[model samples]
Target: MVEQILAEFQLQEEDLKKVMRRMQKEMDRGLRLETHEEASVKMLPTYVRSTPEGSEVGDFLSLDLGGTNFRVMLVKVGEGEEGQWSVKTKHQMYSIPEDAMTGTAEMLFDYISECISDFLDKHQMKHKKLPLGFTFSFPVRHNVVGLLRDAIKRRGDFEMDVVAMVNDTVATMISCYYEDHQCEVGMIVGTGCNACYMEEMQNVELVEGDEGRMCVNTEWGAFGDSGELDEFLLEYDRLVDESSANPGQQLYEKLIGGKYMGELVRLVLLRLVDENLLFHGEASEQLRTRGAFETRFVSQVESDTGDRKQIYNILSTLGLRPSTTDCDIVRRACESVSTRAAHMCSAGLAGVINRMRESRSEDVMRITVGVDGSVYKLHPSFKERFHASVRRLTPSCEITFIESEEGSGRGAALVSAVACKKAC
Candidate 1:
């Protein structure tokens, strides 16, 4: 059946192998630190500080700001059974206004503050100054939870006093740590991609002196840029990087994140069609529309039964009209796109594992990575691919993937509690 499908779509086993090889190479190289100085430095400074041990329970608020939507939640954390704590959560999601995305930071924060106020008022909890966990999903530099070093383009233009400025990957990791003890790393693969892991302060090299007092936040997404790639991949990567929010940063993410994945597929499909590689004698107008396709289409194609009718149904959902032959072509296109994404994701994971191996000498440090985001959660083979990638890279280490139970909102609330103690 697989052979028939491939033959119908003009895809060969060699093509698949080539894609896989490209992915493996990228993953292996991408994980290495650019500088020897980075190699000797610690990635994350904070350690597992507390394990929900005491009766220090409080009502906390969490706010998640990302590229597409804003999510807010209220959580109550306290001691439960067997020294484990119970957490209750309530949440609501709001679409970010188009104009607000481009406005000043104050404007965005004011809107966020108002939303919090409204939520509290409606719930009749305004009298209490609830601790807040502001899960800033953008890229920001933070040390020991209170300092801000730099801001990426993800969060709108503006910077202010944020208690704990964390990237989405770090925020997910913290959430997993509080909710469960199983996770070692936190990763995101949607709209954007990144990962964060814990590091021992002793292993890290200092900037000048005495830098080992705290954990470090190592931003791994910005690792690969020496103008090296096969000509085709190079050109495509360059274009994507140049057009991103933080141009020249997160080059791999630009190629794999959801926001650009479909677009990348479209670019490839257009080129193929123009050269008579896949789709021939067809107008490419439909494929050119923005959002005309999505990453989910790739999953469907991989899973769909070989019957052309079923394949057509899948294409229709992606807003494409397909005939029998077109079904075969579209299915191949989906496979190609998804396969590339999965491979790229694996590479990112490989890099993290490599970094960990170099820093720690333990046969295997029980490392847990917390993961969130639509693509990582929903994609069919994402978890499997991620695990395979890690194992292939670090054969001896024990790595675990943990899904976050308490989201950014809950994490923010915990941060608030921690900050309050220091403030007083």
Candidate 2:
């Protein structure tokens, strides 16, 4: 009876195996910094510039327009002895409506502008046009420190002068550089997954018919397939791809992003349920509900002992029943899903490293990768898997992972500082 149900759902053992193998290949590829160097350098463009040998104080404001939340901050930079400076800042986050995500860019921008005005008014600092660091975490074509074009995403109605736009990954890298001195790459693993790297303009291959430049931003997430996917994995990824906003770009993100992580696990569990491999006899109402199972549940299953007692206890929390066999099946399903996610993340990293090796080849230079969002921070074994992947992929170059501080908010302030310096 269970087997019949699984067949109806179109999930077969062969399909599962195929997904697992594809995930493994991605794990083996490891992460890379897409600096267009012979060896991959840190992918994020470090927004650092040489400052004059004098202390100068200034006020700046930064806005972080991310997918999940909007953050704003005010910063004070005071000149210190020699060329050093002291910094102080404050920030706040506001959650926008889900409907706003799919709304017009103008609506989004209006909301953001209102937020900025509110913040400024509350602080009673509305008189000054403090240099604004707009940290936009979307795919935009930027030239000469301004946004040239943007990929259509859920960017709330922002059709205005967008000066100095940076990719989310790159913005995170800048934030990491400002906080931890050791981070080399900035990655966004939340609703969507994409990365960026800074390169010396001299080495970058210019877009056809354009003048040569010294710095380039490589949108690494768009690099896909390259004849690497096999049959079953391809099918599974295609299902996810076809369902995504930008199907072809960032295929891995569709699989691992926060929006899809729980869903993917549930898909597997539903299949098992049909096969009677897990819940047997009667189906629980919880199992039939959408988003019934969460990624945290998968984490719990992996961490807990693979016994019916513990499994039953956890299921009870979710108002469900489970037998010994059901517990075993649940544990196995969790392991399979988590393992696949970890491996695919590693593989995506590997692909980046490979791309970097062909672009940059400098040694004794430190490269930092900046990481942001909760998935990378909270997931059980994500960091461990990423570390392992890096070790396996790039042995010659020293690679360091740093958690982003001040996030998009603080990074925007830093960008404002850099921009001010350039203006002077």
Candidate 3:
């Protein structure tokens, strides 16, 4: 037997180069489409001026409204860096009621306000006024998210001053800035993917007449499939897209997110089964159903160095008995898919870094990208593989991919602390 399974994973260097080149083209198009009528990438302008430099001090609060989740965090910052950087923090979590998720936007806002009011009531933070940053994780414009501002003013007799509003990516950037002070890029790579970075005024044509720098939420998951892809998309990749809610969309996400990775492996295996390369000339009916497998399965099997029990168990669930040889083939298929996802991320990341380059007099430079989310934080070899491609693309500068653990949440508090000083 020729081990047809091996061929599913035989990606050539040239093919990856093509994907990289396509990502470059997409990045250029996004920048060009900034505030334009024909824009594919949103490139939303966040009025945030600068990321935290770790010298920010004061008692600050951060309220987060992520999808299906919300948190209230309190961070106490000292006067400066060094010993001052030893910060203290507290937080609480809450769920959005089903009514809030389905009702009008006002209902959701009201529920958030009620939750914040309860937080103050429980924490005995009624008398004092503190600077607070509101982190809205959804795609939003700064000017539009006024509900939080109004709610904060109404609760606890305006005990919390709404100093700044930032999205999760920007929050991660701000939080990481406290840790590294030099990092600029902020990104998330969980169920979906997106990134943001501070952009100079000269490079930004969308906003008129501001001679200052600001953060640009690249919303990079919107990359590809905007009347533009599937050439780099393999057969299983195509099936993943076709099965999505919006077919021919989120192409970038499908290729590189946790939501689609397990299914991608499933499709690959199904194809193998169809061709008699698997299950000893038989296909499992359970595999015909949707989502019978998940990314956790992929993670489990890929991490299996001992006996590959996860693969055997998964196959057993699907009514097939898998041998060690069969398990190894599936594992290779998983590796190939994951590697492709990593390099695809690298291509986009390298493109964004080059897009934000500045002309400093220094001969050498280090760019720190604050990264977090399920993919970056939990994936076994995510950072190592990601760095390989980013380093290959941007050889002159050292690329540091830092995991800002809970950076998105803490960043909101940090950004709020800085905004308190700057609000003149």
Candidate 4:
């Protein structure tokens, strides 16, 4: 019975394979397009590296400006096994209020400085001025230091010095590669998705001659927006985009990002209800509400590898007492959506690996990616599908995937340790 409904999703092994192929072609196009000019996917260059060695010793302060919240950390890195860190003491997270998000830019940055000031007061470490590393995830256009310093100067009147800044994706890669030399790419798959890879100095056409390499921030959420994209996006995906904050933008991200994956399933279920396929043709009113069903619910559904008890609890919370058949329908829908997302994510990761392999010599052999975010970590069967897709995408390439432990927080600290060691 569930099979009849599952077949409508059209996510067979072949469909998944087709997504992989399309992603590879699009990635190559994006790699070329970004080098030429701004097209769909902006492969921006960052003054950051993947190899952080973690041997950097300093009293470091780090900040992560995430999509919804901001986080802060303070760590004291000394000598350790294989020149790694020994201690990390303070860490904190703060929510971004609605005003902060929609308010003026000055309001946002001012609150960010306030958060730092509060952290200093709580931690009681106001004596020494420490070098700071900023995980500013947005596409920074100007000097990150000047803006942050301005915020501190105007808002908090704090004493911390801005030493370095990096894209969160680059920070994730650095934190993972810091501990394990194999990790060459860092990626975030929650809320939205993007990747940073270790690019050789010669291939980066945007920059001048470099003694060291740089990490390419492949802002690939817009990959399917340009040529030959209609096939990859379904009706629901387009609907999601039309109804999104940034219409006709980040189409690829809509298909796979954590923010939209749950909504995708919601749309699928709505149509199923119309056709007497879910909830006995009587769709719950709650499901139709804005963001009532979320990727968090989808994560709950799929993560129920133990007799699938969690999905029932979640469905009930969403005002539904789904029957066993309805449960099966919703579960398969969730799985289909998640699998497609993983397949697309795998393609992006595989694309980075393929591009990196083009210019490397014999000495650079380790190929591992550092992945972070709630979706990548908690989504059920996510790793399974991603690994399967990677194998299907590039059967011959030797690759690995790892988690970046506190990637943004720790990676920023490490970047500060390195960036400020010589200058400050």
Candidate 5:
């Protein structure tokens, strides 16, 4: 019964190919001016025309807000010998309160502004107005950039020039671009999943530019909101979506993001128990609860060796007394769910990379994808599996995956620094 249920999570080659093709179609639609409004993937223009030229020098403030926590950083980009630049950053992380995360947009921005104020005062730089860059990673329907500016102005506590704003994916790309100029793609697979890449300016119809490339934040999380993945969505996925704060939204993210992977595995486990495939048809109270299984458990179970002790330990923590067979069943379930997610994520990335290659009309493309996320980095085999599938799907391209270390905060600051340099 467990094996039968696991089959539902397995995606065949044909199924994955369909996903890659569909993603390409949606990306095209999103890029077109007329069709963008209705397209599930809103390929929003970041207006980031170029990466840094190593001449930017400044003490810029960068604010990163998208994940559960917020970050504020003071980044100093100084020119070195032979046109080289060095970046020194001091940063602090603030845990966002639940009320701010779920409250009105005004409240959220206000909290963000307060954190900036605190960071500046603590550094004894409150009087200096610096060029600021903001990395707003949230995908919502709002003028968030303006909201943040207004929030800072309303407080009257501090002042700074808001120079640039970008989503995390674009920021990650910029951060990685500092290391390798060939890196034009950025992806995040943490609490949520999204990607951004440089597109030929002529292809961005919504924006009036045809001379250079612009980074397009492929809000791919919304890729399936228009029923694109109906055939692939499972019952567990549907439940996850229905219970989400915004149902019928971010469907792709729910399917592939770290925030929901554990729950999907849990749902599978409960079904297996109901079918008398594990735990002698008994599920503990925690197992019955939603979100009781953390996404970390999926990585833990999959990391187990021949002994499979990790699975047993995780199940025991979940209040389940699992025999060796039960442990095996749980481990397989985790692998199934995570494997599907990696495959789906890879398909989306393949779609993006394939488009880049074709746009340039290149026989073979060599590119680096700047990736940052807990799931992609922490998961034992996710990076390997994702890389393999992406390569298979986009055989014409030779790809390099660079995990971002400076993170989005520095990325945002670099954007600001570059903008300042261009202005001068």
Candidate 6:
């Protein structure tokens, strides 16, 4: 039964190829003028045409409000010897109260402003008006820039020019671009899975300009929302979606994101227990509870170096008594789930790389993808598996993956610096 269930998560090379082709089709629909609104993968234009030339110099403010924490940074970009750029940063992180997160937008922005005030006070830079960049990671269907601006104005302590607003994926790409000029793509595999990449302006039907490239936030997390992944959906996946806050949405993310990976694994384990394949067909109450088995446990169990001790330790925490065979089967289940996730991510990334290759009509393409997220960075085998599958899927492209540094906060400041340079 364990083997039968594990096979459901396995993807052959041909399966990955189909996923890649389907992703390419979705991307095409996303870019077209008439079909853009209906496309699941919303390739939203960011209007950022140029990256840093390493000549930008200034003191800028950056704000990152993506998760439970709010970060404020004062980033100073300076010119060093031999035309090298130097960036110095000091940041403060403030935790958002539960009420703030659940309250009205005004309440959230107000609390954010309060944090900014304290940060500026500690740094003693309240007198200076700096170019500001805001990295808002949530999915907003409308403009909320005014909300932040209004909050700060209401504070009446300091002023700033809100120069740029970016999604976390675009921020990661820009952050990576500072290190590697070849970095044209940014991807996140942490709590959620998404990507952004540079695209030819001629192909971005929603925006004007045809000579240069623009960054498009490929909110690819929603790629399968419109039934694109129906054939691949399994019973466990359906259960996850049904219990999610937004059902029938972010289907691709639910399959691969860190938030849902453990839940998927748990569901599989439960099925195994029912079939008398794991834990002697017995499950602890803790194991039966939803979200009790975290994604971290999956990583921990997979990292057991030929020692069943680590597996025993983890299972003990979940109030389970597992035999050696049960430990081995659990490890196999984790590998199956994580491997499939990496393959799916690779197929989607291949779609992007292949499109970029075809857009320029290049015989061979060399590109870099800036990647972040705990799952990609922390999962022991995920990075290697993801890289191998992407290479296999996009044979014509030579790809480099660079890990992002302070992607959200630092990248926001870089965007501001670029915007300031262009304004001058």
Predicted structure with the largest lDDT when compared to the true one: 5
lDDT of 1 by residue, 141-220 (tens): 59213211133123353332222434555556655655554555667767677666544334433322222222234444
Candidate lDDT values, in order: 0.52, 0.51, 0.67, 0.69, 0.80, 0.79
In candidate 5, stretches whose alpha carbon ends up further than 4 angstroms from where it belongs are: 51-132, 135-144, 147-164, 406-424
Model 2: residue 20 alpha-carbon error in angstroms: 16
Candidate 4 lDDT score at position 263: 89
Error of 4 at 115 (Å): 24
lDDT ranking from best candidate downward: 5, 6, 4, 3, 1, 2
TM-score per candidate: 0.59, 0.57, 0.72, 0.70, 0.76, 0.76
lDDT of each residue in 65-153, candidate 3, tens digit only: 77878778765545445554445566788898887878866677777777867776676655334445666676355832476666655
lDDT of 2 by residue, 1-424 (tens): 4434323324243444444344334322322323233322223222221123221123446666767586776664545577555555667887777776678665555566666666877876563334356666653458213322242113344433222334555556555544554444557765556554443333333212122211223343433434334332433346556666665555545555656666666666676666556665456777666666766666556554635665677677666677766776666655555555665565555445544554566653356677676667666565565577555555565677776654333445365534444333
Clashes of 5: 0
Report model 5's TM-score to 2 decimal places.
Answer: 0.76
* lDDT at residue 264 of model 3 (Cα atoms): 84
Question: Model 2 clash tally?
Answer: 43
Please, what are the lDDT tens digits per residue for candidate 4 over residues 1-424?
4466545555666665555566656554544635436556677766453224322323457777767777787765455567744554566888889978888767777777778777877766563344466675653458545666677788545454334544677667766654665677788888998887777655566655444566777788887777446776777888898999898888888877989888889888887888877888886789887678888788777776566577787777778878877887788888888887887777667766765666575544457777888898888587778887876665456777787664234455465534433232
- Candidate 5 lDDT tens digits, 1-424: 6678899998878999899999999998999988988889999876655324322223456676777787776755555577666566676888889988889889988988788777777866674545456666764666766897889889875454344545667767776766676888989998899999889878989865476677788999999898999888999999999999999999999988999999999999899899888899999999999999999888876665567777878888878788979988888888899999999999899989988888888778999999888999888777778889889988778899898764334455365534544343
Residue pairs with backbone overlap in model 5: none
Q: Which digits, one per residue and each the tens of the lDDT, describe model 6 over residues 110-203?
A: 9987777677768665534444566666644575568877887887754543344456777677667666768889898998999988888788
Q: Which sections of candidate 6 miss by over 4 Å? A: 51-132, 135-144, 148-164, 406-424
Alpha-carbon RMSD to native, per candidate: 11.1, 11.5, 8.6, 9.6, 9.0, 8.7
Q: Which model is ahead, 4 or 5, in terms of lDDT?
A: 5
